[PDB]
Structure 1
């Protein structure tokens, strides 16, 4: 009996805010959240309570504290089969991590379409608004190992496994709408160049090193996605607050055989929000698991990540109607030209039970499509199709990875394939080949048709010679970078320039910095000059005269490319630090906490030590964390209630908490004598936008603070922060 008598070891099986209860396996935290896939996993879920400890062969163990020896101080004996199994299993726990996207965090949920899309695709999962499709989604970074940090600057993966009634469909996308390269043949080159350098295996989780920017300087096709990575897109606040894209043009095929080109989007219903560079870098130190934690705790709290699936649709006859090639993955399709049509909603509503079994072993592959969908000749997509099955042979130990529970279809699967390492299914069919007579040819092929039919490829015409040649239509590199740049707000553009400037400052060979600056001058002179100035590089007269690339089909900006130009703020699921003192004004805290609760914003009560403090009226306040323990990096805003401020006014940690939150543009609210902290952050007597202050936390104080939180950060504060030593 080692559990505490009071049952406080065990979290409540009900939704609870972040930090209120220990986190737990999803089926223990939320046993009543079900879907067809989660229910199909019941055959392999293993409990523990009230069971005897055994070997893997079912033999009960008596003494799991000692090896068998000759004498209690003697040598360990070879006959200890219980020690031997236990250490053998530990010795072989690890499997290779994914070659890319090794760092990732996943959850179960479900998808439903808003209406039947039968007129444009015969895909069964999109045929009926009442048809629910279980999903498993993994979000990831790209470069770093499985043990690397979350809030790096990097592209993010967004992969969705739809368990449909007509087969698994995997939509394996990223959080930007283009990729760095055009042809899959260059993927090992590009990835080698971004990953840690081969002599010393540095740096982890960073593109800020010579080989990455050497490759970018020599391959201008990369510049478009490099622009996105250098923007705040590269440092999202949360996987719930980034967009997702399939990048490639695919096809939808309807029952009549008509093909429509499609690009896939996910829209975050929580809005778009990103960190700022200093905060994201520092957060990789103070909490390298910040995104993983945030996702798990949002789900435990009921702040389920929701995303709307959208399609950009282009008729077959419009293939050649744009200035860029629809099959070129380094080009986006601006939403001003081709709007996203809303298709359905995905809700992620339960964590896994065991991260290794369900997350680490999940296998997604963009070749897993279903009837109603098809490929195009995008030469990056075409090469992906060879990679994702092949890599799973070593990563997951063989060709039966579809029998690992998380990967299993929920629909029927039967065929003549046999054997392979780790074969779970025991086939009874007398035949392992077709055509066969001895089993009357079962299982049988099925013709294509409007529903439940066999897969047939769209009969696209192919005409040309066998060539290793890039299409001339792909050889334009700067217009899309320039469209992206022009679409950003002035503060977004500053952050882009600072991203390039910081990264190129870590490039040891200066000629590479210069070469990158030369590429930037082909995109936009203002951007190039501002990066050059930060690097102590002077543009030449030739660089100053490079003519700007043309507009994209007449567009000189598209606001859907900005994170912030069109407000889409959502405060639910955000968190506020509350800096306590040893005699808090209980009326402020009542007003603060209830206003946050009403909008679904969480709070963390911080102090200079753990335990409790007692408010003015005797209310006992439990402390979640110390000021150092849960730094301002981990919250969206900071509130300091009135009370005995002299308690914390000389606490360097308390003062620094505010200076850090101030530098990183977060809303700050100060009630009563808490306004004494104004001098720490140098606020004028008459106040400033982005600082909420009043005699008490009552009246409009919390509404004003929540309004700032809806706008995410206080961009107008940017000029004032340069000066502050934080």
Structure 2
């Protein structure tokens, strides 16, 4: 029993067997308002009422600007080896070494209430709570992105998201604004195809691969570096739905993917992924017919095979 949420125990509050209280302490009853007479008006001096409702009124925080619709779970990452030959990272520094993680899977264009089974790119964000600090791999289930410059992110996202006049349509790329962008910015064509493939409608979060998408660098204590690409390969296999199925599913169960992730873990069948990488020598950055600093491209495994570092 490692319990990834062991650190989170200190902030858990148990209200079982206890009396009602105010947020500042003291025992109360909060089912009746304070009125002046039998059928009177409610009093401003009912501190119990205002303290309760104020919290309710302020319960909402802004939803994420993108990847608003998602769900997540805690886990543990175990390293397969001592990888100091390629990286000085603590969480990959010893064999059988365990690091707590949290992962959140998402869709890019829908809001907080949208359907899990809408056609979209999906998110695959992993956090490593290492003993040398938090390290995050924030990535998608598709190895390539729409744009080559970050300054175009407002332009891309605005187009795919609903039209500003009527805010239609929700969680869909099937409108003029999105496809105007795709045609006018041809860089988006690659990811567009990945979206129109099975990747745009996965069966579950547990049935998709994961990518860092960007090329990064791994550095050793001596300071030697290699170009790297992050991969997550599912131990449960890759599976997808069909569009006519997804649409009907979007209505009958919007919580389909998030429920499926919940149920598996709850049923003792925890999902698992293997972390794999591609290693490229710094002189081989432009070797394979494209720049490796281009996120609209991926590096075929015939050029560089995957090496697994952990699960």
TM-score bin, normalised by smaller chain: over 0.9
In the TM superposition, what whole-angstrom CA distance separates every residue of 1:190-233 from its partner, at most 9, and x where no partner exists?
A: 00000011000011111111100000010111000000001111
The answer to whether 1:167 aligns with 2:136 is: no
Q: Deviations over 1:649-670 (max 9, x none)?
A: xxxxxxxxxxxxxxxxxxxxxx
Q: Deviation of residue 130 (structure 1)?
A: 2.7
Aligned residue for 1:475? none
Q: 1:320 offset after TM fit, Å?
A: 2.1
Q: Deviations over 1:414-457 (max 9, x none)?
A: xxxxxxxxxxxxxxxxxxxxxxxxxxxxxxxxxxxxxxxxxxxx
Q: How many residues align?
A: 311
1:92 and 1:176 map into 2 onto residues whose CA distance is 36
For 1:279, which of 237, 245, 254 is the aligned residue? 245
| Aligned-partner Cα distance in 2 for 1:52–1:230 | 54
Give the TM-score normalised by the residue count of structure 1: 0.43
Q: What secondary structure, in the 3-state scheme, does the structure 1 residue paired with 2:100 have?
A: strand
Tell me by how many angstroms 1:184 deviates. Answer: 0.3
User: Do structure 1's residue 194 and structure 2's residue 163 form an aligned pair?
Assistant: no
1:41 and 1:288 mapped to 2: Cα distance? Answer: 29
Q: How far is the alpha carbon of 1:322 from its aligned partner? A: 1.0
Match of 1:58 in 2: 25
Q: CA deviation at 1:65?
A: 1.5
Q: CA deviation at 1:162?
A: 0.4
Shift of 1:33: 5.7
> Residue 297 of structure 1 is aligned with which of 257, 263, 267?
263
Q: Does 1:226 align with 2:192?
A: yes
Q: In 2, Cα distance between the equivalents of 1:335 and 1:202?
A: 40
> 2:27 is paired with a residue of what secondary structure?
coil
Larger Rg belongs to: 1
Indicate the structure with greater helix content.
1
Higher relative contact order, structure no. (Cα contacts within 8 Å, ≥ 6 residues apart): 2
Aligned match for 2:6, one of 23, 33, 39: 39
Alignment of 1:101-140 (within 5 A): 101-140=67-106
1:345-382 CA distance string (max 9 Å, x none): 0xxxxxxxxxxxxxxxxxxxxxxxxxxxxxxxxxxxxx
C-alpha distance in structure 1 between counterparts of 2:278 and 2:121, whole Å: 22
Q: Any residues of structure 2 matched to 1:74-153 within 5 Å, and which?
A: 74-153=40-119
1:343 is displaced (CA, Å) by: 1.0
Runs of 5+ in structure 2 lacking a partner? none
Aligned pairs for 1:217-616 (under 5 A) are 217-345=183-311
Q: Distance in 2 between matches of 1:171 and 1:324?
A: 24
Q: 2:230, 2:81 → 1: CA distance?
A: 17
Aligned residue for 2:229, secondary structure, equals strand
Q: Distance in 1 between matches of 2:279 and 2:109?
A: 31
Give the drift of 1:72: 2.6
2: distance between equivalents of 1:318 and 1:325? 10
CA RMSD of aligned residues (A): 0.9
CA distance in 2, matches of 1:130, 1:228: 35
Residue 122 of structure 2: aligned partner: 156
The equivalent position to 2:146 in structure 1, one of 180, 192, 196, is 180
Distance (Å, rounded) in 2 between the aligned partners of 1:141 and 1:223: 19
State the secondary structure of the residue aligned to 1:74.
coil
> 1:335 Cα deviation (Å)?
1.2
TM superposition shift of 1:255: 1.5
1:548 maps to none
Report the CA distance between 1:336 and its aligned residue.
Answer: 1.7
* 2:6 counterpart SS class: helix
**TM-score, normalization: structure 2?**
0.99
SS in 2 for 1:201: coil
Output the CA distance in 1 between the equivalents of 2:147 and 2:52: 46
1:21-73 Cα deviation digits (max 9, x unpaired): xxxxxxxxxxx5613xx111111100111111101011111x32110001131
C-alpha distance in 2 between matches for 1:292 and 1:343: 28
Give the C-alpha shift of residue 339 in structure 1: 0.9
Distance (whole Å) between structure 2 residues aligned to residue 305 and residue 335 of structure 1: 25
The gaps in structure 1 that reach 5 residues or longer are 1-31, 346-726
Counterparts of 1:344 and 1:234, CA distance in 2: 27
Match of 1:427 in 2: none
Q: What residue in structure 1 maps to residue 16 of structure 2? A: 49
Counterparts of 1:143 and 1:258 in 2: how far apart (Å)?
39
Q: How far apart, in 1, do the equivalents of 2:56 and 2:136 lie?
A: 32
